[PDB]
Structures are given as C-alpha cells and as structure tokens.
Amino acid sequence: RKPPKGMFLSQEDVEAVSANATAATTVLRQLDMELVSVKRQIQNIKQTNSALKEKLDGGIEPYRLPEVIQKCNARWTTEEQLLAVQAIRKYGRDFQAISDVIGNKSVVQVKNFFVNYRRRFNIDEVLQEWEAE
Amino acid sequence: ARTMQTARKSTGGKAP
Amino acid sequence: PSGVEGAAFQSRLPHDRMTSQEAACFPDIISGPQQTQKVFLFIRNRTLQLWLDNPKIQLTFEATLQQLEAPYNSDTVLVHRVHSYLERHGLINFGIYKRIKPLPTKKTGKVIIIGSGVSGLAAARQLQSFGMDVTLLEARDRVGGRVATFRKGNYVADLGAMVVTGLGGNPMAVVSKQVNMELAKIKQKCPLYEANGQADTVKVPKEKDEMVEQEFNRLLEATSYLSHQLDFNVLNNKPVSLGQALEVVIQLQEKHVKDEQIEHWKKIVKTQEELKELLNKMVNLKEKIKELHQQYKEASEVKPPRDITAEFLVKSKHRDLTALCKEYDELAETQGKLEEKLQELEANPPSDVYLSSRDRQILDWHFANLEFANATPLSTLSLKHWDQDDDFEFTGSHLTVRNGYSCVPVALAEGLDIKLNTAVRQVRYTASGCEVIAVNTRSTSQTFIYKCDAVLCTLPLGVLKQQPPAVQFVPPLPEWKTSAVQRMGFGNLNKVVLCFDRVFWDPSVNLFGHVGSTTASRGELFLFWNLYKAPILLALVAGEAAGIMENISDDVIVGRCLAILKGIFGSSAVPQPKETVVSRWRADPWARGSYSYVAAGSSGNDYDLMAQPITPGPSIPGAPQPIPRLFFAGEHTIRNYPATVHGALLSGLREAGRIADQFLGAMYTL
Ligand SMILES: Cc1cc2nc3c(=O)[nH]c(=O)nc-3n(C[C@H](O)[C@H](O)[C@H](O)COP(=O)(O)OP(=O)(O)OC[C@H]3O[C@@H](n4cnc5c(N)ncnc54)[C@H](O)[C@@H]3O)c2cc1C
Numbered sequence: 113r114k115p116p117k118g119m120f121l122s123q124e125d126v127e128a129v130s131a132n133a134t135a136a137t138t139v140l141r142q143l144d145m146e147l148v149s150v151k152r153q154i155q156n157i158k159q160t161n162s163a164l165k166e167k168l169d170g171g172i173e174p175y176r177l178p179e180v181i182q183k184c185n186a187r188w189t190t191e192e193q194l195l196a197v198q199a200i201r202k203y204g205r206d207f208q209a210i211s212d213v214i215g216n217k218s219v220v221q222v223k224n225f226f227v228n229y230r231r232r233f234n235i236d237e238v239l240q241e242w243e244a245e
Numbered sequence: 246a247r248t249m250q251t252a253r254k255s256t257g258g259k260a261p
Numbered sequence: 262p263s264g265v266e267g268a269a270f271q272s273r274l275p276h277d278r279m280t281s282q283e284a285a286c287f288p289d290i291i292s293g294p295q296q297t298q299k300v301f302l303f304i305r306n307r308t309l310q311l312w313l314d315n316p317k318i319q320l321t322f323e324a325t326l327q328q329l330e331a332p333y334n335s336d337t338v339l340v341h342r343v344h345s346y347l348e349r350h351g352l353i354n355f356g357i358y359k360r361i362k363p364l365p366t367k368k369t370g371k372v373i374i375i376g377s378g379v380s381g382l383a384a385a386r387q388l389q390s391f392g393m394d395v396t397l398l399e400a401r402d403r404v405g406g407r408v409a410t411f412r413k414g415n416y417v418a419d420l421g422a423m424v425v426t427g428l429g430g431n432p433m434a435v436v437s438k439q440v441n442m443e444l445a446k447i448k449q450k451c452p453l454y455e456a457n458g459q460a461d462t463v464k465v466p467k468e469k470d471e472m473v474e475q476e477f478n479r480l481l482e483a484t485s486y487l488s489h490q491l492d493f494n495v496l497n498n499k500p501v502s503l504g505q506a507l508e509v510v511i512q513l514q515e516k517h518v519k520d521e522q523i524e525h526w527k528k529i530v531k532t533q534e535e536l537k538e539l540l541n542k543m544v545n546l547k548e549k550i551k552e553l554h555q556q557y558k559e560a561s562e563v564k565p566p567r568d569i570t571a572e573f574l575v576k577s578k579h580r581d582l583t584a585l586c587k588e589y590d591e592l593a594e595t596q597g598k599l600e601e602k603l604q605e606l607e608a609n610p611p612s613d614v615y616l617s618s619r620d621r622q623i624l625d626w627h628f629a630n631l632e633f634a635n636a637t638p639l640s641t642l643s644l645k646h647w648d649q650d651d652d653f654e655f656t657g658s659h660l661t662v663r664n665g666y667s668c669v670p671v672a673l674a675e676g677l678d679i680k681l682n683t684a685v686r687q688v689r690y691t692a693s694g695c696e697v698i699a700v701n702t703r704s705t706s707q708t709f710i711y712k713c714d715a716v717l718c719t720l721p722l723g724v725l726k727q728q729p730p731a732v733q734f735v736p737p738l739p740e741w742k743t744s745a746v747q748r749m750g751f752g753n754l755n756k757v758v759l760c761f762d763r764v765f766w767d768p769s770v771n772l773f774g775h776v777g778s779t780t781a782s783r784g785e786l787f788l789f790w791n792l793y794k795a796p797i798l799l800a801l802v803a804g805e806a807a808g809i810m811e812n813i814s815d816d817v818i819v820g821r822c823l824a825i826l827k828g829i830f831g832s833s834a835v836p837q838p839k840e841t842v843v844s845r846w847r848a849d850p851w852a853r854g855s856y857s858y859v860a861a862g863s864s865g866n867d868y869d870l871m872a873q874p875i876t877p878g879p880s881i882p883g884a885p886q887p888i889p890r891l892f893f894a895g896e897h898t899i900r901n902y903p904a905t906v907h908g909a910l911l912s913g914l915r916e917a918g919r920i921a922d923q924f925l926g927a928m929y930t931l
Contacts, residue, residue: 115486116257116479120517121510123491129512130496136512143519150526157533164540172547172589175554177582194569195576202577212580213573246858246903247648249634251424251659252451252772252788253474253627257481259651 351914383913429656723853
C-alpha cells in the first residue's frame with residue numbers, strides 16, 4: 113500500500129536514478145559535493161565567528177555604571193525643571209528617558225509636567241525644535 | 246523460488 | 262486444520278468452495294442449488310479424509326459408500342462420480358498402496374513416458390493403475406533423475422532434491438507414510454561467519470545479524486512496492502529484474518541518507534549565520550559603548566559646581582550609556598540561545614552511511630540465499646513474478662530425508678516397465694499415433710523404435726532448451742510452445758559433500774553461513790548443512806558462482822571448503838575428508854541445469870503454456886480434428902509448484918489424469 117517505514121521511494125526520485133546508466137552515480141555526486149561545499153562553508157563561518165567573539169572579549173564589564181537607586185519625588189526643584197526642559201529638547205516625547213535623566217520623577221509626573229508648564233517653558237517650541245532633527 | 250528457502254526464509258514482499 | 266476440512270486442506274483444496282476443475286466435471290452441481298454443493302463438498306471432503314487417514318490401502322467406491330451416512334450416502338450416482346473424479350486425478354490412491362482389486366488383465370491404450378524423474382514415475386504408476394500399457398524411457402542407468410543420492414559405506418547425501426518443504430498440504434506427506442523415508446526436522450538456527458580475508462574468521466553478533474536481515478527484508482518489500490504500486494516494470498524496453506530493482510532501491514536509500522545530511526548542515530549554517538550577524542551587532546555596540554563611557558567619563562571630570570547644561574550632560578550621557586547596556590544585554594541573552602542551539606544540532610548528526618562495507622557484505626549473503634532459492638543471479642529473475650507461487654507454500658517445518666531422497670523414486674519404480682540407458686533422440690506424433698526413436702547410451706548406434714497412442718514428455722527444461730537440439734520433434738513444436746521454452750528460466754545450483762570420520766562442528770546446529778569478501782562471489786560456498794547421521798557437511802554453490810565453479814576441479818573446491826571450515830572451527834579440528842563429491846548440474850547432459858525460475862520477461866503463465874498438450878494436424882486433409890498426442894509433465898510445468906519434487910509429483914498426476922480422460926474416456930462427467 114505504502115513503502116516500508118522510512119524507506120524512501122518517491123515516484124520522482126525513481127525516474128531520476130534510472131533515466132540513464134550513470135544517472136545513478138551522477139546524482140550521488142552532485143550530493144557528495146553539495147555536502148563538502150557546505151562543510152567548508154561551515155568551518156569558514158566557525159572561523160569568522162571565533163574571531164568576532166575574541167573582540168567581544170571582556171564583555172562590557174569595565175563600562176558598566178553602578179546601580180543608582182534613589183526615591184521618586186513630588187516637588188520640582190528649579191534644578192529639576194531645568195533638566196526637564198533640556199531632556200525634552202533632546203528626547204522629544206520619550207517620557208521614560210526624560211524620567212531617568214531627571215532621576216527622581218515617574219513617567220506620569222514627567223507627563224504631567226508637559227501640561228503644567230506648557231506655556232511657561234514653551235514646551236510647544238521645544239518639541240517642534242526637537243522635531244527639526 | 247522463495248518457497249525453496251529453509252535457512253533464514255526471506256519475508257519481504259510476501260503477503261501475510 | 263482437521264476433521265473433514267483438514268482433509269480438504271491437506272489436499273490443497275478449499276474445504277467450502279468448488280474448484281475450477283470440479284466445476285468442469287460437475288457443471289450440473291455447481292450451477293445448481295446451494296444445498297447440493299454442500300452435499301458434494303462434504304462427500305468430496307469425507308472421501309479425502311478417508312483416503313488420507315490410511316494411504317497404505319486402496320480406497321474403493323464400495324469402501325467409501327460403506328462409511329457414509331444419510332443424507333450423504335443417499336444418492337449413490339453422486340458418491341460414484343465423486344469417488345471416480347478423485348481417483349482419476351490422483352487425489353486418492355496415488356503413490357504406493359496395496360490394491361484390493363488386482364489389475365484388470367488386458368490393458369487399454371499405449372503410452373511412452375520420456376524420463377523416469379519423479380514426474381515421469383508418478384504419471385506411469387497412475388496410468389498403469391488405470392489399466393494402460395506404460396513404458397518409461399530413461400537415459401541414465403538409474404531412476405529418480407534430479408533426485409540423486411550419494412551412497413558409500415554409511416555416508417548418505419543428496420546432490421539433488423534434499424528437503425521436504427513442510428508437510429502441511431504436501432503430497433509428500435502421504436508418500437512418507439507409504440515409504441520408509443526417515444524424516445528429520447531442521448532447526449531454524451543459522452549463525453553466519455565472516456571470514457575476514459586472511460584475518461580472524463569470526464561470528465556475526467546478534468545485533469548486526471538482526472538489523473541487516475531486517476534491512477534486507479525491508480529492501481525486498483521495497484522492490485515489491487516499486488513493482489506493484491509504482492509499476493516500475495519496464496526500463497528501456499527491457500523488463501526489469503529483481504537484481505536491478507534491488508539496486509535502484511539501495512541507491513535511493515543512499516541518496517536519502519545524503520539529502521538528510523545536506524539539510525542538517527544547511528540548518529547548522531543558517532543558524533551559524535544568525536550568529537555571525539549577531540556578533541556583528543554586538544561588536545559595533547561594544548564600540549559605541551566604549552566611546553560613550555569615555556564621553557561620560559570626560560563630563561565628570563568637570564568638577565562641580567556646574568551650570569545646569571553641564572549637569573544635564575553628565576546625567577544625559579549616563580542614561581544613554583545605560584540604554585546601550587540594556588541592548589548589549591538582550592543580545593548576550595540572544596547569543597546564549599543560538600550558542601547552544603548549535604551545540605544541539607552539532608551533537609545529533611543524522612546517519613553517516615546507508616550501509617557499511619561490513620554491512621553490505623552480510624546483506625550479500627542474504628542475496629545469495631535468494632539466488633540459491635531461485636537457482637539464479639538476481640539479475641535474471643522477474644521483478645513482478647519471481648515470487649508468484651508464494652500463496653501455495655506448505656506449513657510446518659522443513660525436513661530432510663535422512664535415508665536419502667532416492668528412496669522415493671526407487672520405491673515408485675517398483676512394478677514398472679523402465680528401460681534404462683535409453684536416450685530419446687526423436688519424437689514423432691501424427692494424427693494416427695506416435696513413434697519415439699531412442700538409442701542405447703552405451704553403444705549409440707544400436708537403435709530403438711517405440712510405437713504408442715500418446716507420449717508424455719518429462720524432459721528437463723534445460724534439455725528442451727538445448728541449441729542445437731538433443732531431442733527432435735517431428736513435426737517441430739509450435740512457436741507458442743518454443744517461445745515459452747525460450748522465455749522461461751532454467752537455473753543452476755551445486756553441492757559439495759564432505760565426509761569425515763568425526764563431528765567437529767556443533768552437533769545440534771543444522772545450518773551455518775559463510776560470509777565472504779565480495780559481491781561477485783556471494784554464492785560460493787555460502788551455506789553449510791549438517792543433516793545426516795554420519796558426519797557429513799554439505800555446502801551450497803549458488804548464484805553466478807555456480808556456473809563458474811563447474812570448470813574448477815574437485816580438489817580446488819574441497820580446498821576452499823576446508824579453508825572456510827578451519828577458519829571457523831580451528832585449523833586442527835578440521836581433518837582431511839575421507840570422501841568427497843561435487844555436483845555439476847549445468848554440465849550434466851540429462852539435466853543441463855538444476856530447476857526453473859521465472860525469468861525476467863516471463864511469468865507464471867509460461868508454466869501453463871508449458872503444460873499445454875500438443876495436437877498434430879490431420880494426415881488426410883479435410884479429415885476431422887485429431888486427439889492430442891504429445892503431453893508434458895515436470896517441475897517446469899506446474900505454475901503453482903515450480904522447482905520442487907512435490908511440484909513434479911503433482912504434474913505427473915496431472916497428466917496421468919488428462920491422458921486417461923482422453924484415451925479411456927471420462928465416466929464421471931454426466
Ligand atoms: C541441487 C538441487 C537441489 C534441489 N533440492 C530440492 C529440494 O530440496 N526440495 C524439492 O522439493 N526440490 C528440490 N530440487 C528440484 C527437484 O529435484 C526437481 O524439481 C525434480 O526432481 C524434477 O523432477 P522431474 O521429474 O520434473 O525432472 P527430472 O528428475 O530431471 O526427470 C527427467 C528425466 O529425464 C531423463 N532424460 C533427460 N533427457 C532424456 C532423453 N533424451 N531420453 C530419455 N531420458 C532423458 C533424465 O535422466 C531424468 O531422469 C532440487 C534441485 C536441485 C538441482
């Protein structure tokens with residue numbers, strides 16, 4: 113009914129390994145090569161990646177910035193308001209970034225800020241200035 | 246023919 | 262099975278259906294109502310059983326009727342027709358039995374039977390017992406033909422037929438109850454033994470052994486599937502052989518082993534290149550980082566106190582530097598994935614080779630075994646048909662005839678007119694009769710002429726095949742017969758008999774294999790048999806080897822024999838043999854081969870063609886169509902039982918029935 117289990121005999125393959133006298137050994141040489149021409153591909157990338165790994169050697173360890181864990185806050189010191197205005201000029205609407213730069217304001221507070229000081233710190237202008245980049 | 250086999254009877258392609 | 266349905270089975274008949282032959286002698290019944298059929302079938306079956314329960318005494322119509330009950334013994338014309346049919350076709354009272362009704366004194370009809378093979382003998386006895394005048398012409402100085410048994414002192418060993426292939430439904434079963442055959446069962450166990458060139462000859466361990474066999478059978482089925490489902494039967498207007506098909510399959514198994522590996526390393530690269538891309542991203546980011554850290558450093562550095570923009574810088578760069586350290590961290594994560602997903606694939610390779618050099622050598626032994634079974638190179642067998650008689654296999658274990666198979670033909674010869682040393686040279690058949698011209702093998706100018714009503718030709722297919730002819734048909738056989746003759750295969754296999762003064766092999770083991778070094782010689786001495794009481798070891802020469810070994814001297818042959826054996830059992834456990842024989846069946850001019858096989862381009866149907874009798878043209882033109890005159894029996898003539906003794910026996914009975922219907926008339930058919 114169907115071949116034996118995992119014996120492989122597709123109509124197509126049959127016709128091709130018979131179409132001539134050596135159409136048998138021909139086909140098993142395209143493959144015997146295709147295979148060696150892929151094992152070499154492998155070792156070549158193995159050798160490339162090995163060299164790329166050696167440049168990544170050391171990690172980013174000597175470039176890591178110690179953990180700063182300071183408590184979030186409610187009042188805007190003039191100092192913090194000024195960080196904000198610059199953070200805005202530089203980061204547009206990325207409230208998370210602005211939040212981290214200021215150090216002690218949550219993403220909502222940062223968002224509130226955008227409304228409470230819209231007129232006073234021309235946040236409209238600042239935003240359309242950051243847009244021109 | 247297959248029916249001749251005593252040692253290690255072949256099996257393959259027979260219809261049990 | 263048993264009861265009365267055991268009988269039907271042990272006589273190769275369906276216990277509950279009428280066969281085509283029965284329909285022919287009983288169209289009244291089989292075309293009639295179901296009820297009678299069962300009466301018929303029961304009568305048939307009961308008579309069979311009766312005969313079978315006791316095949317040493319003739320079973321007569323009276324004796325039969327006596328043992329039936331109503332409603333069965335009611336109609337007695339039926340019981341008579343049935344009994345007669347069975348008797349006529351050798352289903353009952355065949356072989357060697359005591360007659361109750363000693364032989365009717367003048368005889369009707371005259372038949373010459375060419376050859377006293379089993380087929381010949383089986384026919385002769387039938388015919389004689391039917392009250393005909395029977396003469397057998399035999400070229401050899403003995404009967405039995407291809408049953409050839411070597412005797413000398415206490416050594417007994419067949420160079421011809423050797424195994425009864427299971428008693429279940431086998432006519433030889435009956436014969437063995439009529440004849441002192443010493444039937445020993447053969448135990449299935451068969452260790453193979455690779456000799457390793459000149460190295461250490463060693464057993465094959467139960468592990469390989471089993472997976473190579475398993476693979477072999479897997480490969481056979483493939484060819485069958487390739488044949489019957491894909492219709493892969495003609496290649497270049499040549500028919501495809503079993504050999505070719507096995508090749509094509511093996512190749513596609515090799516091909517696939519490779520398509521496997523290719524996709525496995527193609528998976529390794531497509532992954533190993535996701536890595537090459539990632540490492541790039543990662544090296545470029547460790548740049549951006551290195552340099553951002555510098556920038557942040559330099560801004561820090563600017564000791565306070567600071568205006569707000571200079572303070573923004575420090576903070577800003579700090580954030581940015583942390584952002585990039587998030588990234589380069591998701592990426593060492595991702596790198597962690599791939600790096601092992603690679604150590605995955607690289608540890609699960611798919612299969613290396615399809616079959617090792619050592620594997621394919623054992624596989625060849627299996628191939629030899631097949632070549633032995635068919636007495637021929639697998640390159641010669643029919644793909645579609647080589648195994649066409651499989652349905653008719655017997656059941657039960659195979660057996661050897663311990664006191665030598667010749668015991669059978671000899672016993673059958675008793676009471677018959679057998680002219681030995683007479684070599685038929687010409688067969689002449691005409692509307693009015695037949696003459697057979699034979700010469701004496703010892704002075705081949707001393708001529709004989711035999712006149713008869715009918716000729717039963719049991720010449721070997723090897724013989725019928727001789728070009729130029731050894732037997733001339735006058736007139737020539739018709740194209741339809743002579744093409745069947747060409748198409749059919751007549752193969753060859755040989756035997757080396759070794760006689761020693763001592764068992765030096767495992768007494769309880771009947772068969773063991775030798776696995777040599779090349780495909781080209783897989784047939785050579787590939788299998789050994791230990792069957793007999795005396796210390797005899799017997800070795801097959803099969804396949805392509807069989808033909809080639811025939812032009813090699815006995816000594817040289819027994820040479821390689823002793824080699825292999827010393828190799829297995831130890832140089833000093835294997836003495837010189839006291840007595841040796843080597844069969845040469847292709848060379849033997851009264852055989853010209855061993856037995857038939859379905860050749861590529863033939864089919865089981867050629868076996869039917871072979872058995873078709875010949876009917877001469879009319880003498881005087883315009884005279885009525887004649888009677889048939891030339892009949893054929895023999896192993897090459899029974900499609901359902903080719904190549905065997907029991908097959909031959911059967912064909913004998915077949916013709917003895919057909920000849921009696923023709924020349925004594927068929928009482929039973931009304
Ligand atoms: C090595 C070997 C092993 C075998 N093992 C088995 C086995 O184990 N089991 C099994 O069932 N079968 C076996 N067989 C096959 C079996 O032996 C045959 O099928 C059977 O014996 C054939 O009988 P036959 O009567 O049809 O032909 P044969 O026995 O060949 O009879 C033909 C007769 O014609 C004679 N003859 C030839 N030419 C002439 C002529 N010109 N004039 C007069 N006479 C002539 C011959 O001498 C012979 O007696 C084996 C065969 C071989 C070769």
